[PDB]
Design a protein around this ligand. Structure first.
Ligand code: A1BI3
Length: 150
């Protein structure tokens, strides 16, 4: 509920900022501090994942054939690949969000920017429904920031 709202806030803003290059300075939700720290963390670690795995991201996007809202409302397969062994950690969660940013950039390229928001929902959706129990035990997005603190 609040975990969903916060996760959606963070993932929606990262994907929009990655696709447009413009920071959304409109105010945050109730938990502004945690979400702003999580977004700053994604700007570091998420951008690096895209740089390292650009070829593999291109191949997976090519295999998924994402081009519309229906394709956007169906990020399985990525959920298979990032959690094929079924193990959950913050690095794999980051990699899922990083691929979402990679798809959002492509949606901007083919003039489908309206699909970026439903992309953030389905990624947030499959993340929270599948890993809720794990996300709560790791103290949510504060544990995310503290893990990647550096
Ligand atoms: S990397 O080494 O910087 O980050 C990283 C670490 N371990 C595994 C992965 N996995 C992936 O990038 C895979 C490959 C293609 C793809 C598409 C969507 C989600 C995940 C992945 C990366």
């Amino acid at each position: 509920d609040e975990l969903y709202r916060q996760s959606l806030e963070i993932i929606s803003r990262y994907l929009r900022e990655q696709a447009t290059g413009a920071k959304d300075t409109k105010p945050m939700g109730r938990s502004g501090a945690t979400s702003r720290k999580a977004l700053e963390t994604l700007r570091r670690v998420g951008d690096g994942v895209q740089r390292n795995h650009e070829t593999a991201f291109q191949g997976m996007l090519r295999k998924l054939d994402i081009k519309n809202e229906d394709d956007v409302k169906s990020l399985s397969r990525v959920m298979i690949h990032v959690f094929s062994d079924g193990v959950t950690n913050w690095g794999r969660i980051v990699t899922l969000i990083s691929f979402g940013a990679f798809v959002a950039k492509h949606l901007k390229t083919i003039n489908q920017e309206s699909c970026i928001e439903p992309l953030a929902e389905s990624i947030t959706d499959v993340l929270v429904r599948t890993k809720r129990d794990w996300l709560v035990k790791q103290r949510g997005w504060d544990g995310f920031v503290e893990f990647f603190h550096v």
